[PDB]
């Protein structure tokens, strides 16, 4: 099962100090994936870590398209997320593809 | 009495220690405020004057020698801070200004220079008649 969702980092880093914007965003992208994936472990591809930190530590990209593929079973349930490249987000929402 | 009529409170902008401009042809170039008539002061409150509040002012060195070294009653015609009349219009005058008036309200000199606010006119009539424009 792979879920592709748009994650508003800007609507997450708001409410936290600017000097620590980027760390809070990484953690936020780890909290949100767990709720959507209904998993207990989130592993972030190094490529997402590049993207979120690309702008800097004070301001981050407003949104990052994330491909959340659950790759965990046997009660390990690790969910892997890799940043997908899109030109822009118009009619974009969670778009689950595939099944067990 | 001399100031006659009822004025709805308008926001008050000029406290004491203010050199309001003087538009009269009396020749007082500038007036420095000393007090506003009928001010019951609360502790540590500078007394303040709105458009049309009789204030006692002292003419500065720039002004004519005779009026200097004396407290003269004046009525503020223009206040820079915006004031809301009951119409709900918010109006702000370009530069703070005053006209020297008698306890009766007779001005020291006939001419009033530039705009005069409508609240000054109701309280003090002589200004109203000589006003070039009542804005």
């Amino acid at each position: 099962i792979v879920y592709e969702h748009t994650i508003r980092l800007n609507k997450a880093v708001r409410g936290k100090p600017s000097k620590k914007a980027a760390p809070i965003a990484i953690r936020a992208i780890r909290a949100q994936v767990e709720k959507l994936a209904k998993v207990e472990d989130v592993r972030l591809d190094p490529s997402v870590n590049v993207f979120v930190w690309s702008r800097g530590i004070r301001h981050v990209p407003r949104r990052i398209r994330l491909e959340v593929r659950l790759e965990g079973d046997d009660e390990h349930k690790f969910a892997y997320v890799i940043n997908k490249d899109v030109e822009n987000f118009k009619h974009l929402t969670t778009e689950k593809k595939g099944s067990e | 009495s001399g100031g006659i009529g009822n004025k709805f409170r308008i926001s008050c902008g000029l406290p004491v220690g203010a050199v309001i401009n003087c538009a009269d042809n009396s020749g007082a170039k500038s007036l420095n405020m000393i007090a506003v008539k009928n001010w019951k002061g609360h502790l540590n409150r500078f007394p303040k004057a709105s458009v049309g509040d009789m204030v006692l002012i002292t003419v500065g060195r720039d002004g004519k020698p005779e009026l200097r070294r004396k407290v003269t009653p004046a009525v503020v015609v223009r206040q820079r801070k915006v004031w809301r009349r009951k119409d709900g219009v918010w109006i702000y005058f370009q530069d703070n200004a005053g006209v020297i008036i008698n306890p009766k309200g007779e001005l020291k000199g006939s001419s009033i220079t530039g705009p005069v606010a409508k609240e000054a006119a109701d309280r003090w009539p002589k200004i109203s008649t000589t006003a070039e424009c009542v804005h």
């Binding site: - | 915006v82 709900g88 219009v89 370009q94 070039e132 804005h135």
Partner: protein
């Protein structure tokens, strides 16, 4: 209702809104909002700014 027009924006100003100001030359100018007023303090020509009706008239979008 009663609607005036701004001395800068030229957008109809509904009653109760806007700051009305009187200049040194004894003329009332009704500013639309803080924006109509702040752009007028430094007299950035209304024509140069594209949001004012006056530029739209000059650029002919209004015709």
């Amino acid at each position: 209702p009663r609607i005036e027009h701004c001395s800068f924006c030229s957008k109809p100003v509904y009653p109760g809104k806007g700051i009305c100001f009187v200049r040194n030359d004894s003329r009332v100018f009704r500013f639309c909002t803080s924006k109509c007023h702040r752009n007028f303090k430094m007299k950035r020509n209304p024509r140069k700014v594209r949001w004012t009706k006056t530029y739209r008239l000059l650029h002919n979008k209004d015709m």
